[PDB]
From Swiss-Prot, chain A:
Keyword Hydrolase set for record: yes
Top-level taxonomy: Eukaryota, Metazoa, Chordata, Craniata, Vertebrata
GO molecular function terms attached to this record: endopeptidase activity; threonine-type endopeptidase activity
Subunit note: The 26S proteasome consists of a 20S proteasome core and two 19S regulatory subunits. The 20S proteasome core is a barrel-shaped complex made of 28 subunits that are arranged in four stacked rings. The two outer rings are each formed by seven alpha subunits, and the two inner rings are formed by seven beta subunits. The proteolytic activity is exerted by three beta-subunits PSMB5, PSMB6 and PSMB7. (Microbial infection) Interacts with HIV-1 Tat protein.
Compartment list: Cytoplasm; Nucleus
Enzyme Commission code(s) on record: 3.4.25.1
Name used for this protein in its record: Proteasome subunit beta type-7
Gene name of this polypeptide: PSMB7
Swiss-Prot record, chain C:
Keywords, ordered alphabetically: Cytoplasm, Host-virus interaction, Hydrolase, Nucleus, Protease, Proteasome, Threonine protease, Zymogen
Catalytic activity reported: Cleavage of peptide bonds with very broad specificity
Class of this enzyme: hydrolase
Residue numbers of the full-length protein present here: 60 to 260 of 263
Catalytic residues, chain numbering: T1
Subunit structure of this chain's protein: The 26S proteasome consists of a 20S proteasome core and two 19S regulatory subunits. The 20S proteasome core is a barrel-shaped complex made of 28 subunits that are arranged in four stacked rings. The two outer rings are each formed by seven alpha subunits, and the two inner rings are formed by seven beta subunits. The proteolytic activity is exerted by three beta-subunits PSMB5, PSMB6 and PSMB7. Directly interacts with POMP. Interacts with ABCB1 and TAP1. (Microbial infection) Interacts with HIV-1 TAT protein.
The protein's name in its UniProt record: Proteasome subunit beta type-5
Residue stretches spanning the membrane: none
UniProtKB/Swiss-Prot annotation, chains F, I:
The keyword Phosphoprotein is annotated on this UniProt entry: yes
Residues with Phosphothreonine modification: T35
Annotated catalytic residues: T1
Top class in the EC scheme: hydrolase
Protein's name according to its UniProt entry: Proteasome subunit beta type-6
Keyword Nucleus: yes
EC number: 3.4.25.1
Subcellular location: Cytoplasm; Nucleus
Biological role: Component of the 20S core proteasome complex involved in the proteolytic degradation of most intracellular proteins. This complex plays numerous essential roles within the cell by associating with different regulatory particles. Associated with two 19S regulatory particles, forms the 26S proteasome and thus participates in the ATP-dependent degradation of ubiquitinated proteins.
Source organism: Homo sapiens
Keyword annotations of the record: Acetylation, Cytoplasm, Host-virus interaction, Hydrolase, Nucleus, Phosphoprotein, Protease, Proteasome, Threonine protease, Zymogen
Curated annotation (Swiss-Prot), chain G:
Entry-annotated residues carrying N6-acetyllysine: K76
Keyword set includes Metal-binding: no
SUPFAM superfamilies per the UniProt record, alphabetical: N-terminal nucleophile aminohydrolases (Ntn hydrolases) (SSF56235)
Protein name: Proteasome subunit beta type-3
InterPro entries given in the database record: Ntn_hydrolases_N, Proteasome_beta_3, Proteasome_bsu_CS, Proteasome_sua/b, Proteasome_suB-type
Cellular-component GO terms for this entry: cytoplasm; cytosol; extracellular exosome; nucleoplasm; nucleus; proteasome complex; proteasome core complex; proteasome core complex, beta-subunit complex
Source organism of the structure: Homo sapiens (Human)
Length: 220, 213, 201, 199, 215, 191, 204, 199, 191, 215
């Protein structure tokens, strides 16, 4: 797990890697850590998966409620304030390493949340287990007010370096770009890995296993 | 506190044929959630007919390899002939028990030919037992690999499936398939696969890459 | 892991399973547990693999030296005593070893039981291992002294079958050795599923 | 500590228990009774943490008597067993857990005989012959050796005789006297008290 | 050593064409206190090899002493034979293993760089005896931070020149000054070639802070 | 980490680094360690981060509601009392090194300090943070009663400079704050 | 481990137009077996099953608790339940005990109620869903079943090869396992009908 | 675990033991022998940590045989008892302690009968009737009720019969068969094996 | 506790407090913390007391025997090597904060420092003791390369003054030592 | 309070003829660090009584607040009735006991001095609720150090004058400056008489270092 965020000259580029390890064994090869919050705000999670999931669904429900109650576009600082108040109210028991990003009336705003309730506004953040490699790539090749394809190439490069380094990282790479008007969301950004075709067809035959007791139940 | 052991991982396979012994192993040497290298072959060529693989804690693997080579040279300079396979197995069992009360954290697999020219794989444990089996998979991906060799090599749990002797290139595609399939779910399977084949005519080696994840 | 041994009129029967796990994971299915010391002794494997193999191999060394010094093959009680004396010098250091010693004597049948706790006793019936109590039950049902040969074979084989049916750690193949007056003789190596077919109906 | 065995038949259930009441090291009472008559065809035995046994008898016994007196009729054995399991499963995740381990024995007019099997972790089981304790170990091999699903009751009594003969042979405990019940279409019948003469 | 008193920090080393460059900084930290701001953490071994280390500095002084004495002894043999860098790597591995088998470890993390007979060499030695060869080594947090830069540039192009290698080391040391809390803006570059072993002076970094004007 | 507050005749002057650390890794190079509450009252924090952020937000809440209900500019001692109550009441869960400073119309410039216990004291200058221990020599050497504004700025600049130079955890960049009747003047210096 | 108290293994495998779920039969306390007829695969409506593995207490408790909420849902709304809905319900029910956790790893395998679309997912002990396309497993012998399904799976499978593949996978992965064995029950379902076969596994 | 009793008389010593060999929960051996003939009038029994019993028999037995073969004659029971106590007291304060608890039984031509009493802390004692274990508790009241220093041997056998009848009455253990010796001016006489038929 | 050594052009200057403490009770108000090994080489100690006393006595033994056997005045680096060996060989039982200083005929004034780890380094000035942390600011701000003797004395006086003022364990009275070719000048100051 | 953060040190108080004098110093040590060198550790309660304390300073601020509020309440009753010092002593004892029964102690060690109706009063309150009257009190290390001077002079002569009492307090505070490691050469003297309650200024000590000239 290696998530990253950045702010280019107009908006926000978020990334992810979709290897859900459970301990030491690869449990998933295709997951989704970029979650919905609002039509303009998204979020990424790290660490304990179900904690991030339930927390982000609760906050997304509450902000959808608030936005429909108000009648206008949500603000990112409201999401930040709800998250930090809840995570501090749980005393750091819930582990939810969050990256928060959205575009308000004020513009693009990126927040990273550490699971006790400590938050920071930054132009670029990395979170997760392999965040150090992506933060290395960011500090190497960042400049203020980048363009779009520059930022997309940079975030792809950073998470790719995290996958070629980290052991809990490594799958196909998720991206998300938020502007004032154009929201994009892509399943495989750049698929670095292939897989060798099987060399032996180890296919079983129709009856190669002894059966003791059958049952048939028809349906409609 | 100071912990004296660490798990470097690795995966070693062996297949005993009618007249061949194939030993293969990944070459990733790692620690925790990092990669130290992507080229470190676990196989070692002892004699003209014996290849040993060693996974687990890496420093004990290096030390054990060097001690085995030294005692091989001692046997040669005493008795004018190289050791057999079972002699190396007995000696290695004595060594692995000789540090019982501060154990090696080392899985060991010896493949090679016997004196009749047949395949023989002697497995081990960290404390010093051994047994003559036809196939073993040692290391982190042991449980990902033993039942599939039971399905293909051992012909277990099947019905109306005859027993064909295991040929050579069939064993090769087996080794390649099991390392690809185990590298999909494992975190310790390397990239470089180092396949050592022991025949009655020498030692062959072969390097096959994998996905670079 | 479940072994047993019992002596009767025509010598000693020794049988064992062949499963040796590692925690919840099975290492192998064909671990030959009854360790062949001599053409007249049989030792077992009871918990520790490396420890039983090593110390019984060292006992075999001592016995062969004894034979070459006395021109007379060692008795069973002497061998068990030497094994217990060698094991006691590491008490508390964490040896697990519960083996059995069988063989023929000038006195005849011999059956001893040597622990890593250093217990050394004679007897007529024994069973060692995790599922040993299961073997104790059906064996102490069917035990007598005046038994036939095939009766004892069926008793021991059925006993190990019941043990592996109840225990989770026991399984694999049922080995079967028979100690006679002249020397020991392997009887058969029967799989569990074949016995399941044989005794289910 | 001990174990009470529960052999199920084709049309009867053969349950047995001891008459032993443990202490520090002394046998305080040698005519103890673990039998809790729930209904006319449903028995209950109990072994576990010895403060919970009487209160389980209170809860289950009295709530079954409540159902029977309310609705006019007797419970099935299955629903009663499941009700015990439910009260265990509710009582487990609290500040006050109960630690008991027994099997339940009933008989329906329609379902016939039935044997269930709990644990201190509230697990249902529908067993042909079950066990708990330490007599569990030395007895299930003998019982699984000599079992026939279509077995007659006197053969079951002889089998229980044999099972006891292997209980008094290699045990580190005493277990002198066993009480034995049987359940049929006629209800709850008591067989003779099964002891073995000491001196 | 059970408890390391005065630790160094990360060491970087990478091969290039006919040479190995190694650079580590010059700070001796106790806890959080940067107590010793002028120390040397690279020994220039005789003419073909070169050592850099991390962890407890006292143990590094000890191994400095022992290796110096061994090199002096072979140079006094007068046979024309020297130690290959791989022989030194093997000896050091055996030393660490014999330390840790007796439950008295030398708290270090050492990098051996050498160039002999046409071939470059870059070896690693851990405290636990874990030892291997690599085209680029990185210790401590360098394995988390400056390792992906090394493996990034080395995967796109496996060989390098000396200028490119030195520039890459400068960038990696800049990054380590950026995000190590136990780091310091003064480092020395050490280089082996066929011309001998050369230690450059205490260079520094040029940093950027234009993100601070962003509120 | 290393935070500093010095008053002078007209008003007060604050200062902090920004090197917010976690373990041995630097998480953030630049941080608003000093936080506005009212237009004339600041606080600078240390210890754990989430604790001080939540406490500073709740104090901002209570103080803003009270100062609107007063229809008068608030006192500094009031905000100090609020931090005192919230720190002292939960000394079991918080690690606060809160230092309050700010100019007041009634009482001029004041500096209050609240360490990890929950006590409250008025000082003429204050040292807060884990890396302030190293410059207690310098602040008990160089300080002189009755400085000017520029002398206080130069003073705290040299102070936080030496603290950043020696301690490993401190570092980053220097933030300053000057509070008087005329306004708040913030700047980011290095040297 | 509390997860290694009673053993257990549940495998689900997605085929071409059908889905097959299988589990073991053994029940016992850690080294002592008790019975060979313990139920771990429960019916939740038609053409949709759930498998439960781990501690048997939470198995029966969560199964009855889920049946409670399931029948309440299917009586408040006349339609039958979609599989994503069931997945979210199990996730919410497990997450209600965030700090009082059940010890179970539910596996859901069922078809689409409108189309013939298959569905598989698995959850963790706190409520982390995971939808895949090939297979999900749960229990002690995880790594064995991972090796089997990553070794033997093909994307487009007729039900016969589906049945034999899941059969061989379960037999071999169970036979390497110690605490989980004693028979296999297999449910192979499709759009038209539901087939349940039991395999001749080693009773050791 | 168990206890072996040692009743002393005017001119005889009545020692006895069990035939029980404990395990995990099983009774591995039902014909065990704890009797270690030191000399022609000195016996030894042993109960404790069951790896030390045989080696104590080795050490003490063989060194007493060394004294007898060297100097030409038998030890007193008192000096042999003190020699055992000395080897215990030396073996206590080391890295290798022994954990046994048995009383010693001898007979002198001049001092007559003698009973000693050890512990796992190497304490000598000269007792009229002594004990160890858990049978100690349930048996010393009966023995101290019916004791006369001038008691005849058949009365002692009847008293031991009574003591066993209170061992099989309130004990949590099995203890089926006891072997019984006696020592006189003639030497070691083996009495009959004292069992109860169970079924 | 708080020990200090500063070299200058002609020689070196040492200094220490004497507040040797045990727990929270002052056992002794005045202590010879600095020790003459040879007539031109000093050491000042910290950490545990008995450890450093035994080490200084054994170093005095070996160095005196060696310097008599040389029939030449000893080097300072020699004594530094001896303390290095004895500290490093038994890092497991000793707690030594030994700082070696002294003028030498061959090499002038030198200052070596040996902390608890047993490492050895040459410095131009040194800070030793548990209460020196509070004046690492002042020793980095006030030091200037190329002081005189009187400036070094005033410097270490102000240093140990602020250290005694701030640390609880430090205190007592100031002992000084000035070492050059001309002699050893010890004095007891307060201020 | 489970762990006392910022502790004071010893407090001295002694009766005399028609008054009670109490003196404690002005230091706010954290651990070993003397962090707060100007604080007040004596509250001058209204006109008849006077409080001094040790231990955790925050709890002293808390009890300062509560006692101030209680005194304000009775002064706003307007009845002409005040609190006797013994009533305050009783209330404070009940407060400490109710703190420690709930396993949440106030980490203090308090001395109450008062003069009302001809009779002097000097009360003691511990953290655990142990409370008594005494002609001379001494807290912390004062009970080890300045207690024998008080009990020495009071046994030879049970009553005192104000000058003798103040001089004895001066000598005891000098001794506590000599041999307390957590002590400081600045203290304030607080005094009650029939004339009211009076707090003297930050006095100091005059020391003797003539033992240092002995080698």
């Amino acid at each position: 797990t290696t998530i990253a965020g950045v702010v280019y000259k107009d908006g926000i580029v978020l990334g992810a890697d979709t290897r859900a390890t459970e301990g030491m064994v690869v449990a998933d090869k295709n997951c989704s850590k970029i979650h919905f919050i609002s039509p303009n705000i998204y979020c990424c999670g790290a660490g304990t998966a179900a904690d991030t999931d339930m927390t982000t669904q609760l906050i997304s429900s509450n902000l959808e409620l608030h936005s429909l109650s108000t009648g206008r576009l949500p603000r990112v600082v409201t999401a930040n304030r709800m998250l930090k108040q809840m995570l501090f109210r749980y005393q750091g028991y819930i582990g939810a390493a969050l990256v928060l990003g959205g575009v308000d009336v004020t513009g693009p705003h990126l927040y990273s949340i550490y699971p006790h309730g400590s938050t920071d506004k930054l132009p670029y953040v990395t979170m997760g287990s392999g965040s150090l490699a992506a933060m290395a790539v960011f500090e190497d090749k960042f400049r203020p007010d980048m363009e779009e394809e520059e930022a997309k190439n940079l975030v792809s490069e950073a998470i790719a370096a995290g996958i070629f380094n980290d052991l809990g990282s490594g799958s196909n790479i998720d991206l998300c770009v938020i502007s004032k008007n154009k929201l994009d969301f892509l399943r495989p950004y750049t698929v670095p890995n292939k897989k060798g075709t099987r060399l032996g067809r180890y296919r079983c035959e129709k009856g190669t296993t002894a059966v003791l007791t059958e049952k048939i139940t028809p349906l409609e | 506190r100071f912990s004296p052991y660490v798990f470097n991982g690795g995966t070693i396979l062996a297949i005993a044929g009618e007249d061949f012994a194939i030993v293969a192993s990944d070459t990733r040497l790692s620690e925790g959630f990092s990669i130290h290298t992507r080229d470190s072959p676990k196989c070692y060529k002892l004699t003209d007919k014996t290849v040993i693989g060693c996974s687990g804690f890496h420093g004990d693997c290096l030390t054990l390899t060097k001690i085995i080579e030294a005692r091989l040279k001692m046997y040669k300079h005493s008795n004018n002939k190289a050791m057999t396979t079972g002699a190396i197995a007995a000696m290695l069992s004595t060594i692995l028990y000789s540090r019982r009360f501060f154990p090696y954290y080392v899985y060991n697999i010896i493949g090679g030919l016997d004196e009749e020219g047949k395949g023989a794989v002697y497995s081990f444990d960290p404390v010093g037992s051994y047994q003559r089996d036809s196939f073993k998979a040692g290391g982190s991906a042991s449980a990902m690999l033993q039942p599939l060799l039971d399905n293909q090599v051992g012909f277990k749990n099947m019905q109306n499936v005859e027993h064909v002797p295991l040929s050579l290139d069939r064993a090769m595609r087996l080794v390649k398939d099991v390392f690809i399939s185990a590298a999909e779910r494992d975190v310790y399977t390397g990239d470089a696969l180092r396949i050592c084949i022991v025949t009655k005519e020498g030692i062959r080696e072969e390097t096959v890459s994998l996905r670079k994840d | 892991t479940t072994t047993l041994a019992f002596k009767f009129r025509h010598g000693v029967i020794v049988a064992a399973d062949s499963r040796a796990t590692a925690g919840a994971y099975i290492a192998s299915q064909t671990v030959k547990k009854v360790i062949e010391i001599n053409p007249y002794l049989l030792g077992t494997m009871a918990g520790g693999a490396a420890d039983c193999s090593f110390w019984e191999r060292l006992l075999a060394r001592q016995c062969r030296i004894y034979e070459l010094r006395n021109k007379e093959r060692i008795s069973v009680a002497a061998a068990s005593k030497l094994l217990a004396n060698m094991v006691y010098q590491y008490k508390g250091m964490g040896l697990s070893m519960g083996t059995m010693i069988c063989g023929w004597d000038k006195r005849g049948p011999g059956l001893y039981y040597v622990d890593s706790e250093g217990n050394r006793i004679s007897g007529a019936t024994f069973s060692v291992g995790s599922g040993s109590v299961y073997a104790y039950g059906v064996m102490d049902r069917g035990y007598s002294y005046d038994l036939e040969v095939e009766q004892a074979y069926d008793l021991a084989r059925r006993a190990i079958y019941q043990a592996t049916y109840r225990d989770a750690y026991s399984g694999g193949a049922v080995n079967l050795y028979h100690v006679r007056e002249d020397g020991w003789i392997r009887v058969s190596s029967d799989n569990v599923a074949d016995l399941h077919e044989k005794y289910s109906g | 500590m001990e174990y009470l065995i529960g052999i199920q038949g084709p049309d009867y259930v053969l349950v047995a228990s001891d008459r032993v009441a443990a202490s520090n090291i002394v046998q305080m009472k040698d005519d103890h009774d673990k039998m809790f008559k729930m209904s006319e065809k449903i028995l209950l035995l109990c072994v576990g943490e010895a403060g919970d046994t009487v209160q389980f008898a209170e809860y289950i016994q009295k709530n079954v008597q409540l159902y029977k007196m309310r609705n006019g009729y007797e419970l099935s054995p299955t629903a009663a067993a499941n009700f015990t399991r439910r009260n265990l499963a509710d009582c487990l995740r609290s500040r006050t857990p109960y630690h008991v381990n027994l099997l339940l024995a009933g008989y329906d007019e329609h379902e016939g005989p039935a044997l269930y099997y709990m644990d201190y972790l509230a697990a249902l089981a529908k067993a042909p012959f079950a066990a708990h304790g330490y007599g569990a170990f030395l007895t299930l091999s003998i019982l699984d050796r000599y079992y026939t699903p279509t077995i007659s009751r006197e053969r079951a009594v002889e089998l229980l005789r044999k099972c006891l003969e292997e209980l008094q042979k290699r045990f580190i405990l005493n277990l002198p006297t066993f009480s034995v019940r049987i359940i049929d279409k006629n209800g709850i019948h008591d067989l003779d008290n099964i002891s073995f003469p000491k001196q | 050593t059970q408890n390391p008193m005065v630790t160094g920090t990360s060491v970087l080393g990478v091969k290039f064409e006919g040479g190995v460059v190694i650079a580590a900084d010059m700070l001796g930290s106790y806890g959080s206190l940067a107590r010793f701001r002028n120390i040397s953490r690279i020994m220039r071994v005789n003419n073909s090899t070169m050592l850099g280390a991390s962890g407890d500095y006292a143990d590094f002084q000890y191994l400095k002493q022992v290796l110096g004495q061994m090199v002096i002894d072979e140079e006094l043999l007068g046979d024309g034979h020297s130690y290959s860098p791989r022989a030194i790597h093997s000896w050091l591995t055996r030393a660490m293993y014999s330390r840790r088998s007796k439950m008295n470890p030398l708290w270090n993390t050492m990098v051996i760089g050498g160039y002999a007979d046409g071939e470059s060499f870059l070896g690693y030695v851990d405290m636990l005896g874990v030892a291997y060869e690599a085209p680029s080594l990185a210790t401590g947090y360098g394995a988390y931070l400056a390792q992906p830069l090394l493996r990034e540039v080395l995967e796109k192009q496996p060989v390098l020149s000396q200028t490119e290698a030195r520039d890459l080391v400068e960038r990696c040391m800049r990054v380590l000054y950026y995000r190590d809390a136990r780091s310091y803006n003064r480092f020395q570059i050490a280089t082996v070639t066929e011309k001998g072993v050369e230690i450059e002076g205490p260079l520094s970094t040029e940093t950027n802070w234009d993100i601070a004007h962003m509120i | 980490t290393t935070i500093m507050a010095v008053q002078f005749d007209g008003g007060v002057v604050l200062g902090a680094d920004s090197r917010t650390t976690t373990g041995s890794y630097i998480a953030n190079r630049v941080t608003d360690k000093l936080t506005p509450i009212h237009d004339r009252i600041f606080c600078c924090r240390s210890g754990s981060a989430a604790d001080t952020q939540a406490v500073a937000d709740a104090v901002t809440y209570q103080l803003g509601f009270h100062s609107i209900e007063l229809n008068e500019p608030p006192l500094v001692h009031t905000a100090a009392s609020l931090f005192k109550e919230m720190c002292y009441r939960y000394r079991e869960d918080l690690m606060a090194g809160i230092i309050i400073a700010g100019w007041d119309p009634q009482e001029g410039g004041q500096v209050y300090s609240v360490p990890m216990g929950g006590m409250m004291v008025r000082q003429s200058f204050a040292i807060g943070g884990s890396g302030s221990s190293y410059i207690y020599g310098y602040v008990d050497a160089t300080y002189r009663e009755g400085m000017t504004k520029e002398e206080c700025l130069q003073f705290t600049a040299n102070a936080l400079a030496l603290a950043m130079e020696r301690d490993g955890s401190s570092g980053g960049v220097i933030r300053l704050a000057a509070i008087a009747e005329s306004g708040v003047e913030r700047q980011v210096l290095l040297g | 481990s509390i997860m290694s108290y009673n053993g257990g293994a549940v495998m689900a495998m997605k085929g071409k137009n059908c889905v097959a779920i299988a589990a073991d039969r053994r029940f016992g306390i850690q080294a002592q077996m008790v019975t060979t007829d313990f139920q771990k695969i429960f019916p939740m409506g038609d053409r949709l099953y759930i498998g439960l593995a781990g501690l048997a207490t939470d198995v029966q408790t969560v199964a009855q608790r889920l049946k409670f909420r399931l029948n309440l849902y299917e009586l408040k709304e006349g339609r039958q339940i979609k599989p994503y809905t069931l997945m979210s319900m199990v996730a919410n029910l497990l997450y209600e005990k965030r700090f009082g956790p059940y010890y179970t790893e539910p596996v859901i395998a069922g078809l689409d109620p409108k189309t013939f679309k298959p569905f598989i997912c698995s959850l963790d002990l706190i409520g982390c869903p995971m939808v895949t396309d090939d297979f999900v497993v749960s229990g002690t012998c995880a790594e064995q079943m991972y090796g089997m399904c990553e070794s033997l799976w093909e994307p487009n499978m007729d039900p016969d090869h589906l049945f034999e593949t899941i059969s061989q996978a379960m037999l071999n992965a169970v036979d390497r396992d110690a605490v989980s064995g004693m028979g296999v029950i297999v449910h192979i379902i499709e759009k038209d009908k539901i087939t349940t076969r039991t395999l001749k596994a080693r009773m050791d």
